[PDB]
Amino acid sequence: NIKSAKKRAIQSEKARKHNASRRSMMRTFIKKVYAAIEAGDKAAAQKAFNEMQPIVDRQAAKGLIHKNKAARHKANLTAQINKLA
Amino acid sequence: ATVNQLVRKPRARKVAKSNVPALEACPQKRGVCTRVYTTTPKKPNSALRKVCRVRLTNGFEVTSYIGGEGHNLQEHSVILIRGGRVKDLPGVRYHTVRGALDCSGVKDRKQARSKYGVKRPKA
Amino acid sequence: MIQEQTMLNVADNSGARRVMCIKVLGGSHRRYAGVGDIIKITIKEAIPRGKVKKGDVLKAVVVRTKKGVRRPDGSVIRFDGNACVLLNNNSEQPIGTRIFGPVTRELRSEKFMKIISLAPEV
Amino acid sequence: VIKAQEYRSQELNREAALARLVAMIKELTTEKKARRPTRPTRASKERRLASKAQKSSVKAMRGKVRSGRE
RNA sequence: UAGCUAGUAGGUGGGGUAACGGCUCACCUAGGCGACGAUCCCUAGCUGGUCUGAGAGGAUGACCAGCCACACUGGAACUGAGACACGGUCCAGACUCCUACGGGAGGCAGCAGUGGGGAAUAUUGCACAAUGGGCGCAAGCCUGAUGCAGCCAUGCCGCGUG
RNA sequence: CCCGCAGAAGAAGCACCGGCUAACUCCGUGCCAGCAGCCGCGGUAAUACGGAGGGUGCAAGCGUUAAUCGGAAUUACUGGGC
Ligand SMILES: [Mg+2]
Ligand SMILES: [Mg+2]
Ligand SMILES: [Mg+2]
Ligand SMILES: [Mg+2]
Ligand SMILES: [Mg+2]
Ligand SMILES: [Mg+2]
Ligand SMILES: [Mg+2]
Ligand SMILES: [Mg+2]
Ligand SMILES: [Mg+2]
Ligand SMILES: [Mg+2]
Ligand SMILES: [Mg+2]
Ligand SMILES: [Mg+2]
Ligand SMILES: [Mg+2]
Ligand SMILES: [Mg+2]
Ligand SMILES: [Mg+2]
Ligand SMILES: [Mg+2]
Ligand SMILES: [Mg+2]
Ligand SMILES: [Mg+2]
Incomplete structure (x- = not known):
């Protein structure tokens, strides 16, 4: 580069690795919930939902995702969990 | 007529055509004088008109009149070309600009010297 | 082993795409052209605004052969196709300014130093 | 390069070859007015x-x- | 240029987005657009406005201001409130350059400037003193924005040459 | 920007002049040379070519070319026709 764009490149790669780890973990827990749902066990699905809810809420707090994205995940996972029966 | 007919198909303007297409909406162009010769006029006219076949920078190969009495142009002279046909020379739609860019001025001109590219005398 | 009627790819950017060997130069009855060998070619395929035209007869130096070169230790270097660099018909002096694909040390001579410098490998 | 083979006779063919040569040289060297x-x-x-006029x-x-004499 | 369209048009559900949405996916329905011109082709940044015109209109979009798009070419995302980013990242390409031949670097459509093209269009200027902008509690630093200066009768206006 | 100094000093050109279109003669040239936007001009008395004198217009500009609209009611809606 030619500027302070070098520091931004370094910081952006660092934040890219960090956010990638965080996003992977978050959607891994979301996948946990979805797999429990498509298995058919409401209890396991609820356990996975309770495991993931603080994760997505804290990530929406950190700014990894948006509050709307976290709320949408929670909402349309609760919907499937309830309609599972 | 018939406002209804006009609403259907409106009135079409007469799209004008340029009589100086080689200029391509430029005031002048630059050429090379692929040929220099004389032509006879048409009609009732009778003379030996001095004219040059000129290749322009945009690729156009046109015919340009050399005005004034006497010129120094030849088979490779780079000249400047402005609009204006000759009206008795068929196919000559341009004039050579005298006193500009390797086409010399006219000798001994005292009147209308800005045309023909003649500088002011000693006085 | 390039002979007459062999089609070669063009390893420079002179504009030619496919050329045909029409003569293996140097020696009566000479059959094949290895790598460092000059051949007479005609251009069978060229690009529209290239430095050469289709149907042009000129010279070329082989730079890659499927047959390959053998090294003094017995090793072999083969390529997946036969390529050549086009040369001016009077002085060899490659026509293009770039050279694509690798070449071999067999080309390291005084007349192909331009090629050995422009090549991206060996 | 002329090839004269119109005839079974070589002498006829030789004179035909010379005749073709002369005719061709004449037609090729005659100058257009x-x-x-x-x-x-x-x-x-x-x-x-x-x-x-x-x-x-x-x-x-x-x-x-115009002038109008007035 | 008279037909065009198969995610096409709609629906259900899932996913996705900040957000609605065929945005995406599976299934279902067989629709949807079009002579009030679809589709296709050519050309083109749009507007306030400008020029002309008595108007209606015609032409036009230099400067200035609003919007859009682009940033060597083609893609892509990342970071971030905001970019798919002019002086950031990655990949590919063409070109230019360095190389110890293994590999690397670059992007004036910022301001000057050069070459080129052209009928044709300017200085490789000074200063952040104004006004703005970034950062900073500030002081301040940075600012080719900007303020000025240079060049050019290019225009408009004024005056002189008694 | 103001004041002082000196001296008219240091500071006019361009186009046009047949009609349109404002402003005319002489000379040289002789359908040539050339001019021209249109009509045209020029073959021995040319206000039309070239120079001069005189004049007209504009003026630190003036002409030419290009381009747009106008004139063009010459696409007419205002505002045409068969
Ligand atoms: Mg949903
Ligand atoms: Mg839907
Ligand atoms: Mg259409
Ligand atoms: Mg365009
Ligand atoms: Mg009117
Ligand atoms: Mg560029
Ligand atoms: Mg983000
Ligand atoms: Mg940037
Ligand atoms: Mg740049
Ligand atoms: Mg040039
Ligand atoms: Mg400042
Ligand atoms: Mg700095
Ligand atoms: Mg008069
Ligand atoms: Mg005119
Ligand atoms: Mg006379
Ligand atoms: Mg006269
Ligand atoms: Mg009208
Ligand atoms: Mg009528």
């Missing part, structure tokens, strides 16, 4: 001048009758 450029006839030049008189009579 030069075309000198022609001018308009002076009758037509006077016609041009006369038509011009007549239209000159008519145009002088036409148009603007």
Whole structure:
């Protein structure tokens, strides 16, 4: 580069690795919930939902995702969990 | 007529055509004088008109009149070309600009010297 | 082993795409052209605004052969196709300014130093 | 390069070859007569001048009758 | 240029987005657009406005201001409130350059400037003193924005040459 | 920007002048040379070519070319026709 764009490149790669780890973990827990749902066990699905809810809420707090994205995940996972029966 | 007919198909303007297409909406162009010769006029006219076949920078190969009495142009002279046909020379739609860019001025001109590219005398 | 009627790819950017060997130069009855060998070619395929035209007869130096070169230790270097660099018909002096694909040390001579410098490998 | 084989006889073929040679050399060395450029006839030049003068008189009579003698 | 369209048009559900949405996916329905011109082709940044015109209109979009798009070419995302980013990242390409031949670097459509093209269009200027902008509690630093200066009768206006 | 100094000093050109269109003669040239936007001009008395004198217009500009609209009611809606 030619500027302070070098520091931004370094910081952006660092934040890219960090956010990638965080996003992977978050959607891994979301996948946990979805797999429990498509298995058919409401209890396991609820356990996975309770495991993931603080994760997505804290990530929406950190700014990894948006509050709307976290709320949408929670909402349309609760919907499937309830309609599972 | 018939406002209804006009609403259907409106009135079409007469799209004008340029009589100086080689200029391509430029005031002048630059050429090379692929040929220099004389032509006879048409009609009732009778003379030996001095004219040059000129290749322009945009690729156009046109015919340009050399005005004034006497010129120094030849088979490779780079000249400047402005609009204006000759009206008795068929196919000559341009004039050579005298006193500009390797086409010399006219000798001994005292009147209308800005045309023909003649500088002011000693006085 | 390039002979007459062999089609070669063009390893420079002179504009030619496919050329045909029409003569293996140097020696009566000479059959094949290895790598460092000059051949007479005609251009069978060229690009529209290239430095050469289709149907042009000129010279070329082989730079890659499927047959390959053998090294003094017995090793072999083969390529997946036969390529050549086009040369001016009077002085060899490659026509293009770039050279694509690798070449071999067999080309390291005084007349192909331009090629050995422009090549991206060996 | 001529090939004369019209005849079963070599002497006929030889004379035919020489005849072809002579005919070809004649047709290839005969010079086309030069075309000198022609001018308009002076009758037509006077016609041009006369038509011009007549239209000159008519145009002088036409148009603007200014001075007005007034 | 008279037909065009198969995610096409709609529906259900899932996913996705900041957000609605065929945005995406599976299934279902067989629709949807079009002579009030679809589709296709050519050309084109749009507007306030400008020029012309008595108007209606025609032409036009230099400067200035609003919007859009682009940033060597083609893609892509990352970071971030905001970019798919002019002086950031990655990949590919063409070109230019360095190389110890293994590999690397670059992007004036910022301001000057050069070459080129052209009928044709300017200085490789000074200063952040104004006004703005970034950062900073500030002081301040940075600012080719900007303020000015240079060049050019290019225009408009004024005056002189008694 | 103001004041002082000196001296008319240091500071006019361009186009046009047949009609349109404002402003005319002489000379040279002789359908040539050339001019021209249109009509045209020029073959021995040319206000039309070239120079001069005189004049007209504009003026630190003036002409030419290009381009747009106008004139063009010459696409007419205002506002045409068969
Ligand atoms: Mg949903
Ligand atoms: Mg839907
Ligand atoms: Mg259409
Ligand atoms: Mg364009
Ligand atoms: Mg009007
Ligand atoms: Mg560029
Ligand atoms: Mg993000
Ligand atoms: Mg940037
Ligand atoms: Mg840049
Ligand atoms: Mg140039
Ligand atoms: Mg400042
Ligand atoms: Mg700095
Ligand atoms: Mg008058
Ligand atoms: Mg005019
Ligand atoms: Mg006389
Ligand atoms: Mg005269
Ligand atoms: Mg009109
Ligand atoms: Mg009528």
